[PDB]
């Protein structure tokens, strides 16, 4: 079917490269490390989503004047003024930031939050991109053994 659709558009022939994995057994030694657990990986990403949601609701209820990704100044948008928008911002930026979420938001120099938000950001770092990607990597490393 994909080969026939390749005539209607000469790009469905890219879907035929999936046969190097779902077909011949020259890649089973590598792909078995991923497909061995599978359920563990999807439960890990589910737990990651839940932890990010908890961090999101905490930031939504206690951190207002920080999510201010303004461009050129005096253009506030992409804030945390919405639960779904804040959750998407978290799941899309804070996970891939490589340094937690404290490098993507304003400096927490204001009073009454100098310590609370430092704790928040360091806990996000140590729990999301330190011991929750270590789990994903350990699930791949243990399958080889």
């Amino acid at each position: 079917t994909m080969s026939v659709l390749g005539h209607y558009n000469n790009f469905f022939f890219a879907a035929h490269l999936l046969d190097i994995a779902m077909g011949f057994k020259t890649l089973r030694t590598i792909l078995s490390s991923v497909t061995h657990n599978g359920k563990q990986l999807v439960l890990t990403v589910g737990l990651l989503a839940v932890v990010v949601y908890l961090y999101t609701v905490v930031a939504f209820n206690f951190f207002r004047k920080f999510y201010n990704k303004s461009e050129d100044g005096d253009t506030p948008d992409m804030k945390c003024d919405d639960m779904l928008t804040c959750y998407m911002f978290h799941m899309y930026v804070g996970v891939r930031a490589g340094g937690g979420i404290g490098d993507e938001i304003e400096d927490p120099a204001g009073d009454e939050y100098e310590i609370y938000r430092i704790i928040f950001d360091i806990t996000f770092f140590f729990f999301v991109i330190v011991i929750l990607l270590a789990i994903i990597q350990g699930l791949i490393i243990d399958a080889f053994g």
């Binding site: 009073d111 009454e112 100098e114 310590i115």
Partner: peptide, 20 residues
């Protein structure tokens, strides 16, 4: 104001160990 007072209030409890 709790960024600087926190550590001082935390150390204020160990006076009971310093006295003994």
């Amino acid at each position: 104001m709790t960024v600087k007072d926190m550590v001082l209030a935390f150390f204020s409890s160990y006076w009971s160990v310093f006295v003994t």
